RNA sequence: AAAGACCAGGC
DNA sequence: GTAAGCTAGTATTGACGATACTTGAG
DNA sequence: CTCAAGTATCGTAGCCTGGTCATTAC
């Protein structure tokens, strides 16, 4: 079926509807909530059962049963009160739930074991069901630890479900969960001029690999070099294998005879430091390649490992670099909380046994189990790790990493949005890394390559793309449904060769072979598009390595794409606005990971690339969804220099003053700022049309002229209008909170005197609502009894009118008070501003209205900037936005005189699919203006027609939080 | 290329006897000898644009005035001579002087 | 790296003829530049006919493209091996009565990648290793002699690592000269 | 700069500063009833000159860059040739006043 | 008090 | 008393200058 | 019977001002 008859605008409308359905179904914080939900539903039980039972012997055995968690409640009275996160914020409490486990001890009841912090809007939050306590602008995903809001930064680790080939001694390595599972094959010289030989580092014991071959059960050297499968030639490979044979014979005397090699690995394993409590046969069935059944299969896997090393040696295979994100997994709340809970669960069990072992020697006299287990160990450890930032090291024991838990910012809703979507590569000494600080081509579609910090964390902290998803673990077994597509068993004879067949690997474990690989993969992918295989299953066909890799584990980065061959199923459908589930269930869309995307030809978003030539398998939804949430909304963002886009999307949008909250009566933040009249931009990108949010933009639409103003706007200064400021442009409200606490001696009181300045205080020690407090006054009166008090005084620049006074208490007996002060500011002569293209500057002059230069309708500018700023900063997009916006706020003069005068109006400016300049200038020409964007203006002080034409138009400007009256200091 | 033992299936090392020129093969696990099919006992593989170009030498064929030069010699002529070759990819022709 | 670098200049106007300064430049470059025997070796073939005889095989074309003959390679191996058995005399007594021989064509042609005729060969042997076993002879001829016979240099000087030609003329006007000419 | 160094070689104890203090507001007040700006026309190279730029790239720069970048660092001929094309582009773009 | 830890602005 | 259960036991992102050791041989 | 040297480690590797927090009880 041709796709030409579907048409291009139909496909654009479908792309917009499909992205809108994505954002309705998933939101922007699904990657935090899904991970926490998986930890509560599954991973908690896996921790408490994988920990295992134990028996103290000076016998008494204990076993952990099933684990239950119940909703957060308050026991202030002996009533059970519902506990909401705003209660936890205002009372300086931690918002947490109780965990119960039922133990079984024999030498049986339910014991409380700790409190775990609850993520807001998760399955344990009481706000999941204009409720009292909620803001409309808020989504979940944060924690309230001791009254403060914290977030997890996702941690990147290497993928340990594959083999890693180095080249420093030419190593190939297998890793797993257990530290007793590490397996290394090395190709080196353990010594003139020895030939390079093969060595095994298993259980901290160097063994020749030929001995391990005959220990696992192989009979002949010819079938051992069949297990390696040299692919012929390559005299270095033949030299290394005959050197390893005649070096195996130089260590054991006739290892090929019955159980000689097995006795050798007995006496080689057992002589180490800390030998394992096992014979070698149970050592092989336990610690050698977990997931394989027979020793035949372990010999086959060792031959495959040696083949991989020899293929990397000859230059036919590449070494793994850890900057390619197909070798990385991403750890979020479940993966980190499991690791943190295992430490304090072990610390609880360890101080349980040495407390029981006294009273057990001491006759039964055994207590109930709630005595021998302290519950505050887990509770204190989790909250200490949240409130200090020191998590546990991923693989070092007894160590602690530091870049894990961050503070949640609430300056505008966009700063809170981008603080929840970050990713980090932690490094040892910051300042000597490889290509970690740079964009790699495997970031495409999943991490933003334009926005990143510029300090020490430049490039090490990444931002998720808009349509990016983090996968989760699949709990159903998948290996038995692989046989239905043409996969066959891995037999046990170690004598049959397997040439021509491709190997299949499920999470790194070899489970079978397949003869035809270009039918196996295409049938698995067809069964995934009809919802009888899981949607997060990654299938990669590898022609050079002759291999089929399948991944079902957690931590992979996914994104949706159109499936071209199922794309004709829209015509026959109905264009009612879709669900995402219905488009997934018909095979029109797919979720695709980084490794599968290497087998994909994707058209560049543009339907005109797709439908002018059909040599493609997929197509993007939009190219601007390659960027993060603060970079995809920037107009003409591919028209500016990259340092400027970085300035806008990482720094200046977090500092703008706009929306703050919709329920400010229960928010006692340190600083809260807000505009009087926030506006939205005139232009419409694709991401802003798809998310349908207004709080992504924080600023005003100011009319900007580009002109010199008596030398007052040099060196990146700006000139503003006095009358536009008096009518309320950029007028700001600011609320500051001053807090104090006492025990429940020092108390709150009037302090009985005027040691500072006490005018507005009542008997309780707090002022009245509506008081006008001045610098030098006393805001909170903590009268120590019989004098010698410690009150709180306003500093030398802290003013305001009292907005509210809040009195809170704790559960452990501590009182808190908070007083909020309201100020109203219009811009003064050193306040800081910036456009949406990285052109920051300071206000240097405020001009009267009748002194400004004016047009033939009487329009004067609000902001005047210098023309020396444009040839040098490389931000031409600021001229193209202003020329577009002026075209869409003007009336169409109707030279045609038809009905639909405003039908063909251009207003998008989406990145990577911007309008051309002929469309922008034709839009300006239809509105009655010159195409070049400038217009004649009269001089305001003398009245004469000025000789130069001036560029004018509306730009979205932002008022930043750096204000002049806060920078004044004197020593 | 290595060859394996006929009855034990193990690697054969050359055990050319003293009294006779046979170049036998033998096994370090069983007792079995065999005269070799091939008389090569060790074949091994080894090995497991930075030359100056001119500025202003015109070409008699093309319009390109850069023709990369090098001192070489021929098989009957003792002593060296300078050889030119024009640098355009469609040209590729070499000439003395 | 900069401590070992030296800029060499040249004279002016052989007999006042055009295109004669670059000829002196490559004359001194061809005298200096180092190319070794392993830059021409392709395979190492041990033969049985005392008993074991090594065949270093060559490439015919790169001998001609650099104007090397085989008696040259015999001389430039023999002087270096007699110096190395003379200089630093311990653990180097493998060259007691070791033998060398040269031929333009040998055509022994072990099992793979034949050139069939005039594959140039540097045969070598040993005579002091009167061994009752072949397996230790293969060790000495493939792990001591064949390493030191590959890194023998044949054309150029053994100490110069590289000697390339730069046209200079960076409109810096003799960046490391002060008063010569215009 | 020559006029100011003439004044400060023969004129006084503060006369060069007095020269600046009288010159600068005069120049601001001269420019203020005229204005100075820049439009989209200043930033739009023509179709002809852009075609010449793209033709010079696809003719000269791209076949060379697949040769001399494969050599090592001493060949910065790339920078001289792209600077020649940049000279052509600057000669085009300085036609706007 | 003193150090850690974080963030911002510059260089 | 905490040494940071015992914890590994080398078995995973840094990379250079700067100082200090176990060889042969005049 | 000592220089050099081939490792064997040590230790610093951006730096400075701001504002902030949260600081093991045994
Ligand atoms: Zn045998
Ligand atoms: Zn020319
Ligand atoms: Zn030969």
Q: What is the 3-state secondary structure (H, E, C) of chain C?
A: CHHHCCCCCCCCCHHHCCCCHHHHHHHHHHHHCCEEHHHCCCEEEEEECCCEEEEEECCHHHHHHCCCCHHHHHHHHHHHHHHHHHCCCCCCHHHCCCEECCECCCCCCCCCCCCCCCCCEEEEECCCCCCCCCHHHHHHHHHHHHHHHHCCEEECCCCCCCCCCCCCCCCCCCCCCCCCCC
Cα pseudo-dihedral D7, D9, D15, D18, rounded to 10 = 50
Alpha-carbon distance of A209 to A188, in angstroms, equals 13
Alpha-carbon distance of A414 to A654, in angstroms, equals 7
Please give the nucleotide, over all strands, whose C1' is closest to the CA of residue A388: G22
Buried b (16+ CB within 10 A) or exposed e, A307-322: bbbbbbbeeebeebeb
CB A648 within 8 A of CB A837: yes
Beta strand spans in A556-599 (E): 557-563, 589-593
Alpha-carbon distance of B66 to B58, in angstroms, equals 6
Token pair belonging to C31: 């005298």
Q: How many whole angstroms from A200 Cα to the centroid of ligand 3?
A: 38
Alpha-carbon distance of A618 to A599, in angstroms, equals 11
Domain span at residue A242 reads 164-314
Alpha-carbon distance of A238 to A314, in angstroms, equals 12
For A224, the closest chain B residue by CA position comes to B10
Q: SS3 sequence, A179-208?
A: HHHCEEEEEECCCCCCCCEEEEEECCCEEE
Alpha-carbon distance of A631 to A414, in angstroms, equals 11
Cα pseudo-dihedral C105, C108, C113, C115, rounded to 10 = 20
Give the list of residues 6+ apart from residue A227 with CB closer than 8 angstroms, or none.
A213, A218, A299, A300, A302, A303, A494
Tokens 């670098």 appear where?
A: C5
Determine how many CB atoms are found less than 10 A away from the CB of residue A615: 6
Taking every pair of Cα atoms in chain A, the longest distance, rounded to a whole number of angstroms, is 111
Token pair belonging to A69: 């968690």
∠ CA(A245), CA(A251), CA(A253), 5° rounding? 90
Chain F nucleotides reached by a protein CB under 7 Å: 4-5, 7-15, 25
Alpha-carbon distance of D27 to D31, in angstroms, equals 6
Closest C-alpha to C119, from C181, C42, C177: C42
Alpha-carbon distance of A113 to A345, in angstroms, equals 9
CB-neighbour burial class of residue D37 (10 A; exposed 0-12, middle 13-18, buried 19+)? buried
Alpha-carbon distance of A439 to A245, in angstroms, equals 46
The domain that contains A220 carries what CATH number?
A: 3.90.1110.10
Please indicate whether, in this complex, the C-beta atoms of A195 and C143 are within 8 angstroms of each other: yes
Asked if D71 is an interface residue toward chain B (Cβ–Cβ < 8 A), one would say yes
> Which conformational region is residue C99 in: left (phi greater than 0), alpha (psi within -120 to 50 degrees), or beta?
beta
CB-neighbour burial class of residue A922 (10 A; exposed 0-12, middle 13-18, buried 19+)? middle
Alpha-carbon distance of A142 to C130, in angstroms, equals 82
Closest C-alpha to A541, from A550, A552, A533, A554: A550
For A878, the closest chain D residue by CA position comes to D40
Token pair belonging to A706: 């580009």
Beta partners for A843?
A: A718
Token pair belonging to A752: 């009985």
The data reach a resolution, in angstroms, of: 2.8
Alpha-carbon distance of A309 to A165, in angstroms, equals 7
Tokens 């048409």 appear where?
A: A7
Alpha-carbon distance of A67 to A110, in angstroms, equals 10
CB A185 within 8 A of CB A309: yes
Token pair belonging to A463: 């931002």
CB A242 within 8 A of CB A234: no
> Which conformational region is residue C171 in: left (phi greater than 0), alpha (psi within -120 to 50 degrees), or beta?
left
What are phi and psi for residue C36, nearest 5 degrees?
Answer: -110, 170
Alpha-carbon distance of B95 to B90, in angstroms, equals 16
Beta partners for B45?
A: C43
Alpha-carbon distance of D40 to D22, in angstroms, equals 36
Report the binding-site residues of B.
Answer: 5, 8, 27, 30, 59, 61-62, 65, 86, 91
Token pair belonging to A335: 């993966």
Chain B residue numbers with beta carbons less than 8 Å from the beta carbon of A221 are: 4, 9-11
CB A485 within 8 A of CB A524: yes
Classified as helix, coil or strand, A60 is strand
Alpha-carbon distance of B41 to B34, in angstroms, equals 14
CB A181 within 8 A of CB A290: yes
Relative orientation angle of helices A235-248 and A209-216, to the nearest 10 degrees:
70
Give the list of residues 6+ apart from residue A148 with CB closer than 8 angstroms, or none.
A387, A407
H helices within A841-891, ranges in order?
A: 870-873, 877-888
CB-neighbour burial class of residue A896 (10 A; exposed 0-12, middle 13-18, buried 19+)? exposed
Q: How far is CA A219 from CA A242, A259, A265, B25, C161, in A?
A: 17, 12, 17, 21, 52
Alpha-carbon distance of B81 to C22, in angstroms, equals 11
Closest C-alpha to B41, from C114, A221, C108, C148: C108
Q: Report DSSP letters for A591-626, one per residue.
A: EEETTGGGG--EE-S-HHHHHT----SEE-S-GGGG
Closest C-alpha to A588, from A614, A567, A604: A567
How far, in Å, is the CA of A178 from the C1' of nucleotide G26?
33
Please give the nucleotide, over all strands, whose C1' is closest to the CA of residue A429: F14
Closest C-alpha to A867, from A931, A938, A952: A952
Which residue, counting CA atoms, is nearest to the C1' of nucleotide E9? A962
Taking every pair of Cα atoms in chain C, the longest distance, rounded to a whole number of angstroms, is 75
Token pair belonging to C150: 């590959």
Alpha-carbon distance of C144 to C149, in angstroms, equals 9
Listing from the earlier edge strand, what are the strands of the sheet with A405-407?
Answer: A143-145, A148-152, A405-407
Closest C-alpha to A895, from A928, A923, A869: A928
| H/E element, A284 | helix A280-287
Alpha-carbon distance of A935 to A952, in angstroms, equals 7
What are phi and psi for residue A692, nearest 5 degrees?
Answer: 60, 55
CB-neighbour burial class of residue A742 (10 A; exposed 0-12, middle 13-18, buried 19+)? middle
Give the list of residues 6+ apart from residue A623 with CB closer than 8 angstroms, or none.
A604, A605, A606, A911, A912, A913
Alpha-carbon distance of A551 to B53, in angstroms, equals 53
Determine how many CB atoms are found less than 10 A away from the CB of residue D11: 13
Q: How far is CA A54 from CA A61, A104, A114, A278, A350, in A?
A: 6, 11, 20, 19, 11
Q: How far is CA C22 from CA B55, B83, B92, in A?
A: 13, 11, 22
CB A240 within 8 A of CB A248: no
DSSP state of A479: G
Asked if D72 is an interface residue toward chain B (Cβ–Cβ < 8 A), one would say yes
Give the list of residues 6+ apart from residue A242 with CB closer than 8 angstroms, or none.
B2, B11
Asked if B55 is an interface residue toward chain C (Cβ–Cβ < 8 A), one would say yes
Give the list of residues 6+ apart from residue A850 with CB closer than 8 angstroms, or none.
A940
Determine how many CB atoms are found less than 10 A away from the CB of residue C96: 11
Last residue before each gap in chain B (C to N over 2.5 A): 48
CB A840 within 8 A of CB A834: yes
Token pair belonging to B43: 């074949």
Buried b (16+ CB within 10 A) or exposed e, A657-684: bbbbbebbebbbbeebbbbeebbebbbb
Q: How many whole angstroms from C58 Cα to the centroid of ligand 3?
A: 9
Asked if D70 is an interface residue toward chain B (Cβ–Cβ < 8 A), one would say yes
First to last CA, chain B: 50
DSSP state of A21: H
Asked if B11 is an interface residue toward chain A (Cβ–Cβ < 8 A), one would say yes
Token pair belonging to A281: 């046969």
Give the list of residues 6+ apart from residue C38 with CB closer than 8 angstroms, or none.
B46, B47, C150, C151
Alpha-carbon distance of A845 to A852, in angstroms, equals 12
Determine how many CB atoms are found less than 10 A away from the CB of residue A432: 7
Mutate to test the interface with B, among C14, C25, C26, C171 (most CBs of B within 10 A): C26
Closest C-alpha to A678, from A641, A750, A733: A733
In this structure, the strands spanning A618-619 and A602-603 are parallel
Alpha-carbon distance of A798 to A780, in angstroms, equals 14
Report the binding-site residues of B for Zn(2+).
Answer: 5, 8, 27, 30, 59, 61-62, 65, 86, 91
| H/E element, B66 | none
Token pair belonging to D51: 């075609």
Alpha-carbon distance of D89 to D53, in angstroms, equals 7
The answer to whether the Cα torsion of A485, A486, A487, A488 is positive or negative is positive
Determine how many CB atoms are found less than 10 A away from the CB of residue A43: 21
CB-neighbour burial class of residue A485 (10 A; exposed 0-12, middle 13-18, buried 19+)? middle
Tell me how many residue pairs between chain B and chain D have CB atoms under 8 A apart.
Answer: 5
Closest C-alpha to A878, from A841, A823, A836, A843: A836
CA A795: distance to chain centroid? 39
Closest C-alpha to A187, from A307, A321, A305, A310: A310
H helices within chain D, ranges in order?
A: 2-7, 15-31, 47-56, 62-68, 77-93
How many residues make up chain A in this entry? 971
CB A356 within 8 A of CB A60: yes
Alpha-carbon distance of A347 to A663, in angstroms, equals 43
Q: How far is CA A820 from CA A780, A809, A949, in A?
A: 11, 18, 50
DSSP state of A766: S
How many residues make up chain B in this entry? 97
Closest C-alpha to A552, from A651, A478, A662: A478
Token pair belonging to A621: 């939804």
CA A77: distance to chain centroid? 40
Buried b (16+ CB within 10 A) or exposed e, A336-364: bbbebbebbbeebbeebbebbeeebeeee
Token pair belonging to C4: 């070992």
What are phi and psi for residue A311, nearest 5 degrees?
Answer: -75, -35
Q: How far is CA A665 from CA A83, A651, A657, in A?
A: 19, 29, 19
CB A306 within 8 A of CB A187: no
Q: How far is CA A323 from CA A176, A434, A443, B35, in A?
A: 21, 9, 10, 55
Closest C-alpha to A147, from A816, A711, A853: A816
Please indicate whether, in this complex, the C-beta atoms of A948 and D37 are within 8 angstroms of each other: yes
Closest C-alpha to A863, from A933, A954, A929, A947: A954
Classified as helix, coil or strand, A720 is strand
Closest C-alpha to A329, from A595, A521, A535, A105: A595
């Amino acid at each position: 079926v041709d796709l030409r008859d579907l048409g291009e605008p139909f496909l654009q409308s479908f792309c917009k509807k499909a992205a809108t359905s994505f954002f309705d179904e998933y939101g922007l914080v699904s990657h935090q909530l899904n991970s926490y939900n998986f930890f509560i539903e599954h991973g908690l039980q896996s921790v408490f059962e994988s920990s295992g039972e134990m028996l103290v012997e000076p016998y008494a055995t204990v076993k952990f049963g099933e684990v239950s968690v119940d909703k957060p409640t308050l026991y202030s009275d002996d009533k059970e009160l519902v506990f909401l996160p705003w209660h936890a914020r205002l009372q300086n409490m931690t918002y947490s739930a109780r965990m119960k486990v039922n133990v079984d001890v024999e030498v049986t009841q339910d014991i409380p074991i700790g409190r775990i912090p609850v993520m807001v809007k998760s399955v344990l939050c009481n706000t999941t069901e204009y409720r009292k306590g909620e803001c409309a602008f808020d989504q979940g995903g944060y924690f309230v630890i001791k009254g403060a809001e914290k977030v997890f930064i996702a941690q990147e680790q290497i993928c340990t479900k594959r083999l890693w080939i180095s080249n420093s001694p030419w190593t190939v390595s297998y890793r797993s969960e257990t530290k007793r599972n590490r397996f290394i094959v090395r190709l080196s010289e353990n010594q003139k001029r020895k030939e390079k030989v093969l060595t095994v580092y298993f259980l901290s014991t160097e063994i020749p690999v030929w001995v391990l071959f005959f220990a696992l059960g192989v009979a002949s050297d010819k079938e051992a070099v069949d297990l390696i499968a040299f692919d012929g030639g390559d005299a270095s490979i033949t030299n290394s294998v005959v050197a390893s044979i005649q070096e195996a014979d130089s260590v054991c005397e006739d290892f090929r005879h019955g159980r000689n090699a097995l006795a050798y690995v007995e006496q080689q394993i057992k002589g180490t430091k800390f030998p394992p409590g096992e014979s070698v046969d149970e050592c092989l069935s336990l610690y050698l390649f977990p997931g394989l059944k027979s020793l035949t299969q372990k010999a086959r896997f060792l031959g495959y490992m040696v083949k991989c090393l020899f293929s990397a040696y000859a230059g036919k295979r590449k070494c793994e670099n850890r900057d390619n994100f197909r070798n990385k997994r991403i750890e979020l709340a479940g993966e980190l909380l499991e690791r943190e809970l295992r430490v304090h669960l072990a610390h609880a069990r360890r101080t349980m046994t040495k407390a029981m072992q006294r009273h057990l020697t001491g006759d039964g006299d055994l207590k109930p189990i709630e005595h021998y287990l302290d519950a505050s160990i887990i509770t204190n450890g989790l909250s200490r790790a949240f409130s200090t930032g020191a998590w546990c090291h991923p693989f070092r024991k007894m160590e602690r990493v530091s870049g894990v838990v961050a503070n949640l910012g609430r300056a505008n809703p966009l700063q809170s949005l981008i603080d929840l979507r970050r990713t980090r590569q932690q490094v040892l000494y910051t300042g000597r890394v490889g290509d970690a600080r740079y964009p790699h081509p495997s970031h495409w579609g999943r991490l933003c390559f334009l926005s990143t910090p510029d300090g020490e964390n430049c490039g090490l902290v990444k931002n998720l793309s808009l349509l990016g998803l983090v996968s989760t673990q699949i709990m159903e077994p998948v290996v038995e449904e692989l046989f239905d597509s043409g996969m066959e068993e891995l037999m046990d004879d170690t004598s049959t060769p397997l040439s021509g067949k491709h190997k299949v690997l499920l999470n790194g474990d070899w489970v079978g072979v397949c003869s035809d690989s270009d039918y196996f993969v295409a049938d698995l992918k067809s069964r995934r598009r009809q919802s009888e295989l899981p949607r997060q299953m990654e299938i990669k066909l590898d022609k050079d390595d002759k291999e089929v890799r399948i991944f079902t584990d957690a931590g992979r980065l996914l994104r949706p794409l159109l499936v071209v061959e199922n794309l004709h199923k829209l015509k026959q459908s109905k264009p009612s606005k879709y669900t995402f589930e219905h488009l997934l269930d018909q095979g029109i869309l797919e979720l695709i990971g980084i490794e599968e995307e290497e087998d994909c030809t994707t058209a560049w978003g543009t339907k005109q690339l797709l439908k002018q030539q059909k040599s493609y398998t997929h197509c993007e939804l939009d190219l601007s969804f390659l960027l993060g949430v603060s970079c995809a909304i920037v107009p003409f963002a591919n028209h500016d220099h990259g340092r400027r886009v970085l300035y806008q999307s990482q720094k200046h949008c977090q500092q703008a003053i706009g929306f703050c909250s919709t329920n400010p009566n229960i928010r006692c933040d340190t600083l809260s700022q807000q505009l009087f009249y926030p506006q939205r931009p005139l232009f419409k990108t694709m991401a802003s049309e798809c998310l349908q949010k207004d709080v992504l933009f924080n600023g005003q639409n100011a009319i900007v002229a580009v002109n010199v103003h008596l030398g007052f706007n040099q060196e990146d200064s700006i000139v503003m209008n006095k009358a536009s400021l008096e009518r309320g442009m950029f007028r700001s409200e600011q609320i500051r909170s001053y807090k104090a606490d006492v025990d429940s001696v020092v108390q709150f009181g009037k302090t009985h005197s005027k040691i500072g300045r006490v005018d507005s205080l009542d008997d309780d020690g707090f002022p009245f609502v509506g008081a006008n407090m001045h610098s030098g006054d006393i805001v909170i009166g903590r009268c120590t009894e019989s004098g010698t008090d410690h009150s709180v005084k306003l500093k030398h620049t802290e003013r305001g009118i009292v907005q509210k006074v809040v009195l809170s208490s704790n559960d452990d007996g501590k009182n808190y008070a908070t007083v909020s002060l309201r100020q109203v500011r219009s811009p003064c002569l050193g306040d800081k501003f910036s456009s949406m293209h990285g052109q920051k500057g300071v206000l240097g002059y405020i001009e009267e209205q009748e002194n400004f230069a004016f047009t033939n309708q009487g329009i004067v500018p609000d902001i005047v900037i210098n023309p020396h700023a444009f040839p040098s900063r490389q931000t031409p997009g600021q001229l193209l936005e202003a020329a577009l916006s002026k075209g869409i706020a003007c009336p169409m003069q109707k030279k045609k005189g038809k009905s639909d005068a405003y039908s063909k109006v251009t207003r998008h400016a989406t990145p990577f699919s911007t309008p051309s300049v002929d469309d922008i200038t034709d839009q300006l020409h239809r509105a009655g203006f010159s195409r070049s964007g400038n217009e004649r203006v009269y001089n305001g002080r003398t009245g004469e027609m000025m000789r130069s034409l001036i560029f004018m138009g509306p730009n979205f400007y932002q008022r930043l939080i750096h204000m002049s009256e806060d920078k004044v200091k004197f020593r | 290329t290595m060859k394996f033992c006929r009855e034990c299936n193990n690697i054969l090392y050359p055990k050319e006897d003293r009294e006779q020129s046979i170049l036998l093969y033998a096994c370090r696990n069983c007792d079995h000898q065999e005269a070799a099919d091939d008389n090569c006992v060790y074949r091994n593989e080894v090995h497991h644009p930075t030359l100056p170009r001119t500025k202003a030498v015109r070409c008699a064929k093309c319009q390109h005035g850069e023709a990369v030069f090098f001192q070489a010699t021929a098989r009957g002529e003792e002593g060296m001579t300078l050889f030119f070759v024009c640098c355009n990819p469609n040209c590729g022709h070499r000439w003395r002087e | 790296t900069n401590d070992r670098r030296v800029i060499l200049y040249l004279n002016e106007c052989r007999c006042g003829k055009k295109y004669c300064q670059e000829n002196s430049a490559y004359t001194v470059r061809n005298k200096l530049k180092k190319v070794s025997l392993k830059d021409t070796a392709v395979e190492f073939l041990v033969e049985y006919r005392i008993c074991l005889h090594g065949h270093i095989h060559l490439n015919k074309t790169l001998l001609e493209g650099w104007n090397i003959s085989m008696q040259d390679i015999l001389q430039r191996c023999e002087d270096a091996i007699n110096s190395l058995v003379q200089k630093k005399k311990k653990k180097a007594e493998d060259f007691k009565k070791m033998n060398l021989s040269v031929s333009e064509c040998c055509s022994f042609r072990g099992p793979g990648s034949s050139k069939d005729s005039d594959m140039p060969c540097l045969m070598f042997s040993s005579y002091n290793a009167t061994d009752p076993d072949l397996e230790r002879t293969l060790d000495v001829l493939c792990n001591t002699i064949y390493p030191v016979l590959l890194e023998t240099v044949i054309k150029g000087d053994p100490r110069i690592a590289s000697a390339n030609i730069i046209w200079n003329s960076p409109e810096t006007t003799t960046w490391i000269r002060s008063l010569h000419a215009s | 700069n020559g006029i100011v160094t003439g004044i400060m070689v023969e004129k006084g104890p503060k006369e060069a500063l007095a020269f600046f203090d009288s010159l600068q507001p005069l120049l601001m007040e001269h420019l203020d009833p005229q204005g100075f700006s820049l439009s989209l026309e200043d930033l739009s190279m023509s179709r002809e000159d852009m075609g010449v730029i793209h033709n010079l790239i696809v003719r000269e720069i791209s076949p060379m860059v697949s040769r001399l970048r494969l050599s090592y660092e001493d060949e910065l001929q790339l920078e001289n040739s792209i600077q020649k094309v940049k000279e052509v582009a600057a000669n085009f773009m300085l036609k706007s006043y």
